[PDB]
Each structure stands twice: as C-alpha cells, then as structure tokens.
C-alpha cells in the first residue's frame, strides 16, 4: 500500500 496511501500522503 504506497499508492492509494500516497492518495492519503
């Protein structure tokens, strides 16, 4: 989970 967590930053 970076990418959608990167949607959260």
Name a few traits of the molecule.
about 10 residues, monomer, elongated, little secondary structure, signaling protein, about 0% strand
Blueprint (SSEs and pairs):
Elements: no helix or strand
Protein name: Cannabinoid receptor 1
Family: Belongs to the G-protein coupled receptor 1 family.
Organism: Homo sapiens
What's the short version?
It contains no helices and no strands. It comes from Homo sapiens.
Written account of the structure:
This is Cannabinoid receptor 1. It comes from Homo sapiens. Belongs to the G-protein coupled receptor 1 family. It is found in: Cell membrane; Membrane raft; Mitochondrion outer membrane; Cell projection, Axon. With 9 residues, the chain is low in regular secondary structure. It contains no helices and no strands. It is elongated, with a radius of gyration of 4 Å.
Largest sheet composition: none
| Computed CA radius of gyration, to the nearest angstrom | 4 Å
Count up the helices. 0
The N- and C-terminal alpha carbons lie at a distance of 11 Å
Tell me the strand percentage band: under 5%
Global structural class: little secondary structure
Task: Indicate the percent of residues in helices.
Answer: under 10%
Number of strands: 0
Shape annotation: elongated
Family: Belongs to the G-protein coupled receptor 1 family.
Organism: Homo sapiens (Human)
Protein name: Cannabinoid receptor 1
Subcellular location: Cell membrane; Membrane raft; Mitochondrion outer membrane; Cell projection, Axon
